[PDB]
Structures are given as structure tokens and as C-alpha cells.
Amino acid sequence: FEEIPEEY
Amino acid sequence: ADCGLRPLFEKKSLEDKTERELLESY
Amino acid sequence: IVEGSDAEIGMSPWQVMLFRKPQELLCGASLISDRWVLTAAHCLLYPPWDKNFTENDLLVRIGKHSRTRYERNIEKISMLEKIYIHPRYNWRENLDRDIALMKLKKPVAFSDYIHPVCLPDRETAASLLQAGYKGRVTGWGNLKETQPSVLQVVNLPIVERPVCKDSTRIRITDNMFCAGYKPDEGKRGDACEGDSGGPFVMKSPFNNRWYQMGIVSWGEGCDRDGKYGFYTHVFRLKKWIQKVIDQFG
Ligand SMILES: N=C(N)N1CCC[C@@H](C[C@@H](C=O)NC(=O)CN2CCC[C@H](NS(=O)(=O)Cc3ccccc3)C2=O)C1
Ligand code: NA
Ligand code: NA
């Protein structure tokens, strides 16, 4: 999985 | 309200490539 | 999905990805309002497998096309506020009442790629839920008892209850329906691992709207001859759906 925004 | 009417298909009066297969079975 | 094909962009804008923050794909789900997601209870809770997911364990991803890329400017990722499992979900025997509601931390915004599906009314249900009428299933699950790069779609026929019953040892309930081609039909297709919680939808010929009739629930293997996928019967549980939203959102 391509990493997702950290804010999430 | 606006449920089940797709912005890119129903709302523009375009059909997806296999939806006739559904309708044809009814 | 087995023997399906790539979805078209914006073809299933109510399709949701249940994503585990290891960060892995748990199941599909469907958007029924700006704040409510529908899924399979077993996606969250399955004691035999030691599965009991909580609000803070998951992320909901909406407007997706690709299974793994973070689709910048397209998808929206929400946090769950609360999970509701059907009080009579039967995880001990047959996954009877395999349904849950997830209320989002904040209403999502509609877009070309994010739009809710309708919930059937008794009369839509009455005329569409007929043996031989086709529905559509979508997901990012296994292709084979094996993973797509993009959302897959497959159109499948509802099969007569007796045929369903006689294909398995599990005992079937009024809260389930099964779908697939019969060995004779020379057309294949089925949901597979990772598709659970996704929508089984039909397009009404009366008002040209898409209705979610079923939820990907269970089966035995994927695309086996003489076997069929089983789905939760959304209309039979609609009462419970209303409720929760009403009694809470
Ligand atoms: N449509 C199919 N052919 N499927 C069968 C293979 C993949 C399934 C999606 C999956 C996504 O999570 N659902 C399953 O894992 C739900 N479940 C949980 C326990 C094992 C069970 N399958 S089984 O063990 O063969 C038979 C069984 C079914 C119901 C309760 C217990 C036993 C199953 O289908 C659907
Ligand atoms: Na049987
Ligand atoms: Na089959």
C-alpha cells in the first residue's frame, strides 16, 4: 500500500 | 434524495459498459 | 472478484474501502448517506478468528479506484465515530444477519467519485429480487483464490432459494440470498476473499436509480462449479437500519 497522509 | 444517480453516468445520461446486461435480465 | 473486469472511473461511487491502520484492506463497504457506511458484521467481529475491530482500528476510504495508491485529490479518508452490529448477528453458526453500520466522524462531501447508493423500499425489493435478474458486485478482493490493481466489477444472476439451499450444508435463512451462474450456464464469476462487506446493487428500470439489495457475506471457495455466493438481504434488515440512523444519527 502506498502510505497515506499522517494527518489521517 | 439524490441517491443512486451517478454524476458521471445517470446525471449526464451516459451508460456504463455493462449496465444493459442488468436491464436486459429484468 | 473472480472473472470480473476493471471498473470504469466513477462507475460505483458508493464503493468504500475498509482499511486497517498493519495498514491493510479489510473489506468493501457502501456509502448510504453523507455520514453512514453499510458493511458485513463479520468484517468487524468474528470471534472464531479472533477478529474484534474497534472504531480506532480502522479507516474508511471513499472515491477510490486503485487498490493501493493514495489517490491525491480524489479519495477521502474518514475516521469512524461509532460501529453498530446487528444485535442478532449469528457468528456462531451461519453469519445470519451479517450487517453493521459505521457512522463517520464527519459527513463526507459528494463529488464525481463519491455518491450514495439508495436503500430499497419493499416494492423495489419485490420486483427486482427475482431469480435470474442480475445484480452487480464490486471489490478489490482476490482474483483467483488470488489482487487487482483497480476496482473489479462482475454482474451475477440471482438463483432460486432451493438451488441455493441444496448447494451447501450451511443452513440458509430468510436474511440471505445467493447469486451466481449454474455450471450449465457457461458464464462464471464470484466475489472472493477481501470482497466482503461490498455492495450487491441493481439498477431499477422504473426510476433509473441504483439500489443496494445485498451485502457480500459468505461462500465456500471462489467461483466453484455448483457453488454460489451468499449475500445479506438488505431489505429484510432495513427496519434495523432505519432504527439506528433515526435512534442515533
Ligand atoms: N462468494 C463467495 N464464494 N465467498 C466465499 C469465499 C470469500 C467470501 C467473502 C469473505 C470475506 O471476508 N467471507 C468469508 O470469509 C465469510 N466467512 C467467515 C468464515 C468462513 C466462511 N466460509 S466457510 O467456512 O466456507 C462456510 C461457512 C459459511 C458461514 C459460516 C461459517 C461457515 C466465510 O465465508 C465470499
Ligand atoms: Na443443503
Ligand atoms: Na459457482
Question: What topology emerges from the helices and strands here?
Answer:
The complex is a heterotrimer of chains A (8), B (26) and C (249).
Chain A: no helix or strand
Chain B: H1 19-25
Chain C: E1 5-6, E2 15-20, E3 24-31, E4 36-39, E5 45-46, E6 51-52, E7 58-62, E8 76-78, E9 80-85, E10 100-104, H1 122-128, E11 134-139, E12 152-157, H2 161-165, E13 176-179, E14 199-203, E15 210-218, E16 229-233, H3 238-241
Antiparallel strand pairs in C: 1-12, 2-3, 2-7, 3-4, 4-10, 5-6, 7-8, 9-10, 11-12, 11-14, 13-16, 14-15, 15-16
The structure holds ligand 0KV and sodium ion (2 copies).
Ligand 0KV binds at residues 27, 42, 94-95, 170, 190-193, 195-196, 216, 218-220, 222, 229 of chain C.
Q: Most extensive interface: pair and counts?
A: B-C, 18 and 33 residues
Question: What radius of gyration of chain B results from the CA coordinates?
Answer: 10 Å
Task: Supply the helix-strand structural class of chain B.
Answer: mainly alpha
Q: What's the level 1 CATH class of the largest domain in chain C?
A: Mainly Beta
Radius of gyration of chain C: 17 Å
Q: Could you tell me the strand content of chain C as a percent range?
A: 25-35%
> Number of helical runs of chain C?
3
Specify the overall morphology of chain B.
flat
**If you consult CATH, what is the topology of the largest domain in chain C?**
Thrombin, subunit H
CATH superfamily of chain B: Thrombin light chain domain
> CATH H level of the largest domain in chain C: which superfamily?
Trypsin-like serine proteases
What's the short version?
Chain A has 8 residues and is largely without helices or strands. Helix content of chain A is 0%, strand content 0%. The site of one sodium ion has 7 residues of chain C, from loops.
